[PDB]
């Protein structure tokens, strides 16, 4: 059921409480659920269920803190989902806070009074000395409520770095990077790191290991907050997003390219975030061209993911009060939609487009049924398009554009033909 | 070696003696499976090529395959059969086409269903190219109508439209609210198709909250959607919303898990794979339960829903914790699912990977929850705890241990056996 | 002298026995990897020593020992890197040893859930095995033929799992996936594969395009005896991703 408590050396990020911090937490949290599912070592999850990540960080002043509240808070020198022991498990600030020093169900205090006597009685008055000193290093994490932890100091005869990180409060590279990030955040006043970590994050898939990549990138991503492969790409998207929330059309073009060049899992993640990113950085008059254009483009592997984005953008317009664009961009684009070559696919794109544009409840809700039947053209696929077009033709469109609608349908009727039996 | 060599030599003789036929009819009527099996040997290939050049011989060959099709159904033998029905005589086109629709197409081996669809299409094209006399004589009215009725009463006409349209080419010689949307979502979600479960979950989420319980608890609702419904509803709960979908799915999951436990025998005995059915009045009831395909596939489907609930219950609102009245019925269901999977190994083969996973998911999570642990660790569940140990040990060896190997290398008797099993 | 490499590898075997005692034999929760840092340092020195002696086949053996230790100690993403180092050091002088080391890298990537890395390594294996082991001097020689069968089945399952878009879909992938269809050729298309396995892989590549979920369930139990455990895991991932996709979060 359990793994060891952690108490990270880093404190909560202040920037996350702001307007541009809350909306960042929603979008970067979607990317976090997916980086966890793709590369977590899953050491505290036995079951396959993808989205069950947790960290063993108890609240103190108790119950475990949720993973979605621990964004960038876990120690950078720990690989994602690793729950095993390391030299920094519990921070110096947590032993000062939880035990009031400020310079469970078991009698662990008596176990800690013991051994502080017995080990001192062997190492104060070399194999046993080395293993007993190791034992003191480990067991010091359960020392509470004492001057007698200074018995460690008086008992005198990676290197120093798991130690310098206490005094300032692949295994060599991890702790050396963690030292560098902690200095830059807490002791800024007493730029080469930020350069050479970018060099490490731009080597080959083999010259920079995956656990070195993800830790250094999350290190730089923490330095940007506080105002002080599919998985390698998903991590790089997090660094892009935290920059965007702390040239805009270039920063969106790279996401549409991420959908077109990405594996279906990677593309499905980017298609979940893209609606809110657009709303946070662009007015909907400028959005509407790109999102229709990338649903229609021949360099689009994933119409069924794009069909959920152009539903968010239309439903946003249809609820913010700018209800003109959810007719005007439909009438502008329906020539391009009707003239795309593969007929079942073109008809299915229009069934999505009109479902997404609709007035009512229910016809906004039917979209997963339409997305289910991608590429089909049975009786139910033509009949749905007739009904969904009859919703648009009644409740949206004036006779001059209603004649424009008739004219573009006639230009392809020569499944489109049976609309002329119900539009009249 | 003699059995096959003797047939091959006899095919060589009959191929050199085609001026008479009594030996050709014997070889087909008695050795059709061996002729097909050896069809790659040159004399048998030449003999197949001779049967292709006489109408009565090709007729006898089709009748012989019709008479052994239940043993020719294995993939290699079915391919070799189709390789021996390509090139068959033109006068037998209605006979071989009748064989292709009646006995084939229905096979789960999708490549062989495509091979036979193409061969069935190539034969209707030969009947369309021939004269009306001597084509209509090979398949008349009523016979063609029984072919097309079979293709439409099965799913085959929708799955093989080139064949169905070629048979037609030969034969000629307005928008309600809730009460429509509920009917439309019923058409998708009240049938056993697993092709669109995430889209099915999204659709049932937009049924209004008061109707969900009736829509889910009905006998036609797809149980495969319960795990999707719980997983989708948890996204609403983790956003700080109430989820009518999570609540309905929780009550339907627990109601079904409880309801199938009432079908079990009232008195429980340890499941022991080595020699069952000494208390025959218990084991005959388990055979009647676990051998029924409608009960058996309900268990790992409900276990998928149960495991999806048990993995989240630690981070839910206290309102949604396991009812203390259900804690015995969950342990009984978990045991009965591990027993059912073990029974399927004994009498059939490996269970479906997802179904093995679903049973083991429930077992894993039920031993992690301290309330369910307290039930199975109690004295009155000793035979249930012993069933878990016996079933898990049996599943582990049936997957991991070859015949002639052991799991390790360089107080009724069942309690002592359960001790030795957990220790190794 | 060269006996320094013997001293360093015998020292590394002592440190790896200490790490195996702590992590595998005792399963101590108090372990933090100090013996493994020492093992990686002594084998690193002996690897560089063998390379300045011009013995890259001896350096590769020490890379394999560390990779095997990392895999056995629960670090498969790290082990895959040293298995690929071993393959690179062997390849110009021992092509079949390099294919053994790449096979262990691909197994380690599958343990690490690095499916696109595994797909690339198996593709490199299938290329090298045709280049070094499939000539008249055409059909493959027996040792290479077993590698070719492994790669083909695994790549087909990985391509059915990952489903790459255009331009990620290499000529090598398109060409493999073309074979797993049928149209016009009956009156031997199985290639290196057993014919029973080939017809079930054909059927699986077709059932996944059609999303024919009940056919994939049927094929998964029929293929279970024919596949390796690693390949049965891949086929489970294909059926799992078909019934409940990743990247949706819900």
């Amino acid at each position: 059921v359990s793994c060891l408590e952690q108490q990270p050396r880093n404190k909560p990020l202040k920037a996350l409480d702001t307007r541009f911090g809350r909306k960042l937490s929603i979008i970067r949290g979607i990317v976090e659920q997916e980086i966890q599912a793709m590369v977590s070592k899953r050491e505290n999850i036995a079951t396959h269920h993808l989205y069950q990540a947790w960290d063993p960080v108890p609240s103190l002043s108790g119950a475990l803190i949720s993973h979605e509240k621990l964004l960038l808070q876990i120690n950078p020198e720990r690989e994602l989902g690793s729950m095993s022991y390391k030299l920094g498990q519990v921070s110096i600030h947590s032993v000062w806070l939880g035990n009031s020093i400020t310079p469970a169900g078991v009698d662990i205090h008596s176990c800690s009074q013991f051994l502080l006597e017995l080990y001192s009685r062997w190492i104060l008055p070399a194999i046993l000395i080395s293993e007993v000193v190791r034992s003191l290093l480990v067991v010091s994490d359960l020392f509470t409520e004492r001057n007698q932890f200074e018995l460690m100091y008086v008992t005198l005869t990676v290197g120093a770095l798991h130690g310098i990180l206490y005094v300032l409060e692949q295994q060599h590279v991890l702790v050396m990077c963690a030292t560098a990030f902690y200095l830059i955040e807490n002791y800024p006043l007493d730029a080469s790191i930020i350069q050479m970590c970018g060099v490490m994050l731009s080597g080959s898939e083999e010259s920079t290991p995956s656990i070195i990549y993800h830790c250094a990138l999350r290190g730089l991503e923490r330095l940007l907050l506080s105002e002080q492969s599919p998985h390698r790409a998903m991590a790089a998207l997090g660094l892009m997003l935290t920059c965007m929330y702390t040239v805009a059309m270039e920063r969106v073009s790279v996401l549409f390219d991420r959908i077109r060049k990405g594996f279906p899992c990677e593309a499905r993640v980017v298609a979940r975030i893209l609606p809110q990113f657009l709303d946070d950085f662009f007015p909907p008059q400028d959005i509407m061209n790109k999102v229709i254009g990338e649903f229609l483009s021949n360099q689009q592997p994933y119409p069924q993911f794009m069909a959920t984005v152009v539903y968010k953008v239309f439903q946003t317009l249809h609820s913010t009060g700018q209800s003109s664009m959810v007719r005007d961009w439909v009438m502008l684009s329906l020539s391009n939609f009707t003239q795309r070559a593969p007929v079942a696919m073109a008809t299915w794109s229009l069934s999505c487009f009109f479902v997404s544009a609709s007035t009512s409840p229910w016809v906004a809700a039917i979209l997963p049924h339409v997305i289910s039947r991608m590429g089909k053209l049975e009786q139910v696929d033509v009949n749905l398009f007739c009904l969904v077009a009859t919703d648009f033709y009644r409740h949206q469109i004036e006779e001059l554009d209603r004649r424009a609608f008739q004219s573009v349908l006639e230009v392809v009727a020569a499944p489109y033909h049976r609309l002329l039996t119900c539009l009249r | 070696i003699v059995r096959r060599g003797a047939l091959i030599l006899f095919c060589d003789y009959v191929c050199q003696n085609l001026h008479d036929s009594e030996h050709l009819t014997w070889l087909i009527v008695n050795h059709i499976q061996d002729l097909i099996s050896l069809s790659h040997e040159p004399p048998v290939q030449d003999f197949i090529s001779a049967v292709h050049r006489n109408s009565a011989a090709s007729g006898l060959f089709i009748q012989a395959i019709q008479s052994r099709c239940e043993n020719l159904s294995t993939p290699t033998m079915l391919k070799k059969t189709l390789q021996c029905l390509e090139g068959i005589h033109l006068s037998q086109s209605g006979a071989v086409l009748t064989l292709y629709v009646d006995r084939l197409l229905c096979t789960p081996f999708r490549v062989l269903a495509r091979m036979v669809d193409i061969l069935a299409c190539r034969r209707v094209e030969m009947l369309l190219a021939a004269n009306l006399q001597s084509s209509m004589a090979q398949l008349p009215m009523e016979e063609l109508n029984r072919i097309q009725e079979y293709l439409q009463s099965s799913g085959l006409a929708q799955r093989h439209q080139r064949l169905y349209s070629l048979l037609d080419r030969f034969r000629l010689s307005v928008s309600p609210d809730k009460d429509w949307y509920v009917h439309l979502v019923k058409s998708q979600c009240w049938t056993r198709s697993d092709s669109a479960l995430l889209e099915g979950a999204e659709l049932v989420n937009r049924i209004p909250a008061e109707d969900m319980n009736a829509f889910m608890m009905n006998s036609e609702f797809n149980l495969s959607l319960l795990a999707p419904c719980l997983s989708l509803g948890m996204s609403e709960i983790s956003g700080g919303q109430k989820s009518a979908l999570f609540e309905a799915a929780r009550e339907v999951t627990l109601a079904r898990v409880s309801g199938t436990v009432q079908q079990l025998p009232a008195v429980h005995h340890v499941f022991q794979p080595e020699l069952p059915a000494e208390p025959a009045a218990y084991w005959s009831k388990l055979n009647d339960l676990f051998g029924d395909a409608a009960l058996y596939q309900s268990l790992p489907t409900l276990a998928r829903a149960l495991a999806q609930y048990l993995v989240v219950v630690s981070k839910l609102p206290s309102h949604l914790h396991l009812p203390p009245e259900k804690e015995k019925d969950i342990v009984k269901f978990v045991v009965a699912t591990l027993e059912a999977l073990s029974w399927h190994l004994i009498h059939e083969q490996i269970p479906l990977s997802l179904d093995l996973q679903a049973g083991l998911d429930c077992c894993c999570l039920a031993l992690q929850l301290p309330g369910l642990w307290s039930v199975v660790s109690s004295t009155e569940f000793v035979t249930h705890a012993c069933s878990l140990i016996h079933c898990v040990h049996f599943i582990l060896e049936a997957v991991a241990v070859q015949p002639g190997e052991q799991l390790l290398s360089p107080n009724p008797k069942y309690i002592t056996a359960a001790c030795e099993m957990v220790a190794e | 002298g060269p006996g320094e490499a013997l001293a360093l590898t015998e020292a590394a075997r002592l440190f790896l026995r200490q790490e195996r005692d702590a992590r595998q034999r005792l399963v101590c929760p108090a372990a933090y990897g100090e013996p493994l840092q020492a093992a990686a340092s002594a084998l690193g020195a002996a690897v560089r020593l063998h390379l300045e002696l011009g013995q890259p086949a001896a350096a590769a053996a020490l890379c394999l020992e560390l990779a095997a230790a990392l895999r056995d100690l629960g670090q498969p993403a790290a082990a895959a890197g040293h298995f690929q180092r071993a393959a690179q050091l062997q390849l110009p002088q021992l092509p079949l040893a390099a294919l053994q080391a790449l096979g262990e890298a691909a197994s380690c990537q599958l343990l690490a859930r690095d499916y696109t890395g595994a797909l690339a390594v198996f593709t490199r294996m299938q290329r090298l095995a045709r280049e070094h082991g499939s000539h008249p001097v055409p059909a493959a020689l027996g040792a290479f033929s077993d590698v070719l069968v492994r790669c083909e089945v695994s790549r087909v399952l990985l391509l059915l799992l990952l489903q790459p878009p255009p331009a990620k879909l290499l000529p090598e992938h398109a060409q493999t996936l073309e074979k797993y269809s049928w149209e016009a050729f009956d009156s031997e298309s199985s290639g290196q594969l057993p014919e029973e396995l080939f017809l079930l892989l054909q059927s699986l590549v077709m059932a996944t395009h059609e999303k024919d979920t009940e056919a994939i369930k049927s094929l998964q139990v029929e293929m279970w005896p024919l596949l390796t455990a690693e390949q049965n895991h891949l086929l489970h991932l294909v059926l799992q991703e078909t019934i409940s996709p990743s990247g949706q979060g819900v």
Partner: peptide, 17 residues
């Protein structure tokens, strides 16, 4: 009546359906 779609080979498209 299924075919492969021109813009993505893993998408099926329909002619006789």
């Amino acid at each position: 009546x299924t075919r492969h779609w021109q813009n993505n080979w893993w998408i099926l498209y329909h002619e006789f359906c």
